[PDB]
Amino acid sequence: QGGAITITYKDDVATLDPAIGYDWQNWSMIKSLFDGLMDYEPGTTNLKPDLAESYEISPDGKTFTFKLRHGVKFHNGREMTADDVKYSLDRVTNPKTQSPGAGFFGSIKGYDDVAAGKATSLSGVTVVDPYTVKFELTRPDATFLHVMAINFSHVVPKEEVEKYGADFGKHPVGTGAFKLAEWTLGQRIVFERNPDYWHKGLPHLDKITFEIGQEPIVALLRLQKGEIDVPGDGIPPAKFQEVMADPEQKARVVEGGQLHTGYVTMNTTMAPFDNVKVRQAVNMAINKARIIQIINGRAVPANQPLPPSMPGYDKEYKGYPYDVAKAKALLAEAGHPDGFETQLFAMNTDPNPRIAQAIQQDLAAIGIKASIQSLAQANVIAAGGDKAGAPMIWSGGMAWIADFPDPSNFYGPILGCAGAVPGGWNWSWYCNKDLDAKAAEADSVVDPAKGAERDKMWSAIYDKVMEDAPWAPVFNEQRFTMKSARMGGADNLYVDPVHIPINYDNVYVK
Ligand SMILES: [Ca+2]
């Protein structure tokens, strides 16, 4: 009940639009300003109705009917109704919105017509009455309920989108537990409790202040002084062991496993990375153990796209060897015995400039001279979302943590054709239509007793991805969160698997 906390970040926020935001800094911010039909029990991945009060599924699993809560108000005071759910889904799937999450809705009837520009409304989403919205699917979809909890299906008010247009992401209006109060660009973002939030008793805090442009190391000092509550950029490597060995700081640390993989993307449409042998050479060039030492051993080396604890992870897959001689030999086969020059993009928050320097040295060992383009995250992400931009990107600090705990989440948006779109997060621009179809087939296996078979279908998909080498996977990272002594709540609210980073709506001050 009450309290005003402070959270630091070095990088800035470019958007709070739920159709657009997708990075580690704004994902949970957006979840606190907006709501969708579904959410999760705080601290877990257990689905629960949110803006829906209840729902029904047809026996064939292709018709979802949601009964909406009554009396839900947007921050502007207007009642939310089923028309707003329809509008939001029509908007996020419309290609002109440039949502990196449009593909999550591919199983809805009429999606293809919308994606192809033949329709501006999803035929499969119908407003039955002001408080009933129905979804009809073309195929069973094992991740549909999770997608009705993902930011991209959060509900926006069309009159506010019309008012601000492309600038709606700077003026978010939602139904969520907090509303935007102050946004001083490059300096501070203030969330205030929404006093009329439909979920009574939430949030607990009165105010969250995000202080921008703050050095990660200084933030630890401020936390020791009680002048901030959460260092948003976590524990810098230079300070990790000292934090761990100081009981008065170790007591502020919460550690959690993640469904995470960090990787180097290669743009499969930009020469020279349009040659599979060049991409496989890069896979054999990276010294993952050395990179992991930079982050204090807080990770294990990744040999494939899925995190080791994700269902579908190929436990047997051997992977590309770390083998400079083989990498050079492959580069020569590809017509580059003398190597080549290229660009490696990275976000500029520690430790990612240093990790990029390590990758750069690894590439130099096989004859690739890569200049590091160390930029703000928004500009790395935008360059990735440009088919003609970013030959290589180190994903550290930006991607990928599963939005929901299923192997499908590591495909569509980052390795599927659905993500190889303007503004997308498939920075490899890797589009394999045959795998897209196999992915839809795998997500149609909905019988929970067939989960093992479905996990192996996904393993087969990622086996093929790995053969085409659009990624060089590097590591699977542990999460370390720091919180001030006054911050109450269970550990799993500070390493929340869904409201990534912190569950802003359910933490509290003691
Ligand atoms: Ca919410």
Domains of the chain: 4-15+176-256+480-509 (3.40.190.10), 35-159 (3.90.76.10), 262-477 (3.10.105.10)
Q: Rounded distance, CA 388 to CA 370, Å?
A: 17
If you measure from the C-alpha of residue 184 to the centroid of ligand 1, how many angstroms do you get, rounded to a whole number?
23
Angstrom distances, CA of residue 285 to CA of 34, 296, 324, 329, 363: 43, 21, 6, 12, 6
Cα 383 to ligand 1 centre (Å): 29
Q: Are 16 and 170 in contact (CB under 8 A)?
A: yes
Cα 106 to middle of ligand 1, angstroms: 23
Distance from chain centroid for Cα 255: 19
In the structure, ligand 1 is a single-atom ion and the residues with CB under 5 Å from it are 31, 35, 176
Question: Left (φ > 0), alpha (ψ -120 to 50) or beta: where does 339 sit?
Answer: left
The CA-CA-CA angle for residues 202, 169, 51, to 5°, reads: 35
H helix intervals, 34-77: none
Query: How many CA atoms does the CB half-sphere of 453 hold within 13 Å?
Result: 10
**Residue 331's CB: how many other CB atoms inside 10 A?**
26
Distance CA(278)–CA(291), nearest Å, equals 21
CB-CB contact of 459 with 311 (8 Å): no
Task: Please state, in angstroms and rounded to a whole number, the distance separating the CA atoms of residues 186 and 12.
Answer: 6
Query: Helices 276-283 and 324-333 meet at what angle, rounded to 10?
Result: 170
H/E run at residue 440? helix 433-443
Residue 446 Cα, ligand 1 centroid: separation in angstroms? Answer: 27
Contact 504, 35 (CB under 8 A): no
End-to-end Cα spacing for the chain: 9
Strand, coil or helix: 337: coil
Q: 34 CA distance to ligand 1 centroid (A)?
A: 5
Query: Separation of 177 CA from ligand 1 center, angstroms?
Result: 6
Measured CA distances, 322 to 119, 287, 362 (Å):
49, 7, 10
- Ligand 1: distance of its center to the CA of 349 in Å? 28
| CA nearest neighbour of 458 among 504, 509, 502, 405 | 405
> 128 C-alpha vs ligand 1 centroid, how far in Å?
24
CA of 323 to the centre of ligand 1 (A): 47
509 CA → ligand 1 middle, Å: 20
Question: Rounded to the nearest whole angstrom, what is the distance from the C-alpha of residue 280 to the centroid of ligand 1?
Answer: 41
- Rounded to the nearest whole angstrom, what is the distance from the C-alpha of residue 126 to the centroid of ligand 1? 23
Name every residue whose Cβ is closer than 8 Å to that of residue 508 and which is 6 or more positions away in sequence: 1, 3, 204, 205, 487, 488, 489
Distance between Cα 147 and ligand 1 center (Å): 14
Distance 53 CA to ligand 1 centre (A): 14
Give the single-character DSSP code of 441: H
Q: How far, in Å, is the centroid of ligand 1 from the Cα of 85? A: 14
Chain Cα centroid distance, residue 324: 32
CA-closest candidate to residue 30, choices 509, 505, 508, 510: 505
Print burial letters for 371-410: b (CB count within 10 Å at least 16), e (below 16).
Answer: ebbbbebbbbbbbbbeeebbbbbbbbbbbbbbbbbbbbbb
The CA 116 to ligand 1 mean position distance, Å, reads 31
Q: Are 273 and 267 in contact (CB under 8 A)?
A: yes
The two beta strands, 207-212 and 4-9, are parallel
In 128-199, which residue ranges form alpha helices assigned H by DSSP? 144-147, 158-164
Q: Report how far residue 101's alpha carbon sits from residue 92's, in angstroms, rounded to the nearest whole number.
A: 8
Report the candidate in 452, 418, 204, 184 with the shortest Cα–Cα distance to residue 312.
452
Residue 130 in tokens: 């002001």
**Distance from the CA of 139 to the center of ligand 1, in angstroms?**
28
In angstroms, what is the span from residue 228 Cα to ligand 1's centroid? 24
Which stretches of 101-250 are DSSP H helices?
111-115, 144-147, 158-164, 216-224, 237-245, 247-250
**Distance in angstroms (rounded) separating the CA atoms of residues 152 and 101:** 6
Q: How far is the CA of 503 from the centre of ligand 1 (A)?
A: 10
Task: Give the span between the Cα atoms of 343 and 430, in whole angstroms.
Answer: 18
* Cα four-point dihedral sign 296, 503, 36, 11: negative
Measured in angstroms, how far is the CA atom of residue 148 from the centroid of ligand 1?
12
Tell me whether residue 352 is exposed, middle or buried, using C-beta atoms within 10 angstroms of its C-beta: 0 to 12, 13 to 18, 19 or more. buried
Provide the 8-state DSSP code for 465: H
Is the Cβ–Cβ distance between 169 and 21 less than 8 Å?
yes
- Asked if 154 contacts 103 with a C-beta cutoff of 8 angstroms, the reply is no
State the distance from the centre of ligand 1 to the C-alpha of 161, rounded, in angstroms: 19
Give 200 Cα–ligand 1 centroid separation in angstroms.
13
Pair of tokens at residue 494: 């500070």
Give the amino acid at 170: K
